[PDB]
Amino acid sequence: AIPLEDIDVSNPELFRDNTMWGYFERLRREDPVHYCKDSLFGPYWSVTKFKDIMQVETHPEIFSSEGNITIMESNAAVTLPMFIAMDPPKHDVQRMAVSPIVAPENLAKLEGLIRERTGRALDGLPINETFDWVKLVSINLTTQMLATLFDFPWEDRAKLTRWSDVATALVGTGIIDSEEQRMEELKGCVQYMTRLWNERVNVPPGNDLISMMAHTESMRNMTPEEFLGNLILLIVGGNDTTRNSMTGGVLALNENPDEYRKLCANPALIASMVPEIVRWQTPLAHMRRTALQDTELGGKSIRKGDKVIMWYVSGNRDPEAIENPDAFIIDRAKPRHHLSFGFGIHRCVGNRLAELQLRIVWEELLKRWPNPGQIEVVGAPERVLSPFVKGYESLPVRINA
Ligand code: HEM
Ligand SMILES: CCCCCCCCO
């Protein structure tokens, strides 16, 4: 309906209302590398096709991550130094320092702890009564995992969920009312983690992220802003994406009862379902780059300093890359063929830990409630107002047993 030159896919309302899909379909068909002059976030390029996103991801010497990796320009948290928002060489050193916490030798030891925690959380759910899945399952388990990643005082766990929400929120969406309040609450995050750092620098490293960072020579002189940037990366990385994936799967099985039927008939399909849930959800809708020089991408002239947006949410629905991409299919032959974890030097380091948490939830769900329709959505979900976080504030669920 709207003239092509004035499509603004970044409009946060489109993500809350779940209407953004159509605009991305339109851009994929008519103008896959689309310039937007007017938005909440100033001008930017939209890269909407799987092939073109792969192209941007694999040319970091052209498409820099340096200052910021989001479309947001007024959010002072996303402009803090963080290794996701760094080019090589500094990026490579800081990624290697965090990578060990989510290394498979440490994911075997974690599998048992995730299973006991998951079991206990499901055992505490009410039966034949509506509850909020996001509060009782998704926030609950993902927060527990992030506390363990940080060796965070378990009694203070909920602080992690808050800091995560504050880092990514739009002003006046129910989280924080101004940038001054965002930085005030994140000051408390830096203060808390600084106490933990002081206890763990100058003593043998623990297996916990604060220890790993305090004992990597390149990170030892970090300013509180540098420390806070990496903290919020790890905090939003280590809860919000898995959280929205955990919620997303319940919704996807309820919208597609045929797939819920296949799953219950063959619980081995969890192996191929989990990657599909992560594609379907695309918990981070996009990632931003900044052109360091004039370049051509899908036959378009991108200028020096231009903001480029890789819309994973569009790429994961690209029929050129994925057969029948708008269907939720839990038994795809190549179900890990998606952009939800991105690609290239910044490819998600936590992807195996995210998939491990999701596998264990679905295993433990089916051991207790194995029949199709038992985990039922009984109300519309409340979606997040963001072009970055594609997630759920609430999801009403009733377990029929
Ligand atoms: C469903 C779950 C998850 C999704 C969808 C997700 C998605 C992503 C995406 C898109 C990126 C940027 C990739 C790029 O631009 O090419 C990323 C990076 C990252 N993710 Fe995740 N992630 C998830 C889970 C996790 C978890 C559990 C951790 C745990 C600590 C984590 C830590 C990171 C970190 C540290 C980076 C920065 C990587 C770098 O620049 O080298 N992520 N993730
Ligand atoms: C602004 C907080 C960090 C945003 C990037 C998180 C990426 C986790 O996959």
TrEMBL record:
Keywords: Heme, Iron, Metal-binding, Plasmid. It comes from the Bacteria. Heme b binds at residues 289, 343, 346, 348. Transmembrane segments: none annotated. Heme c binds at residues 91, 95, 289, 343, 348. This is Cytochrome P450.
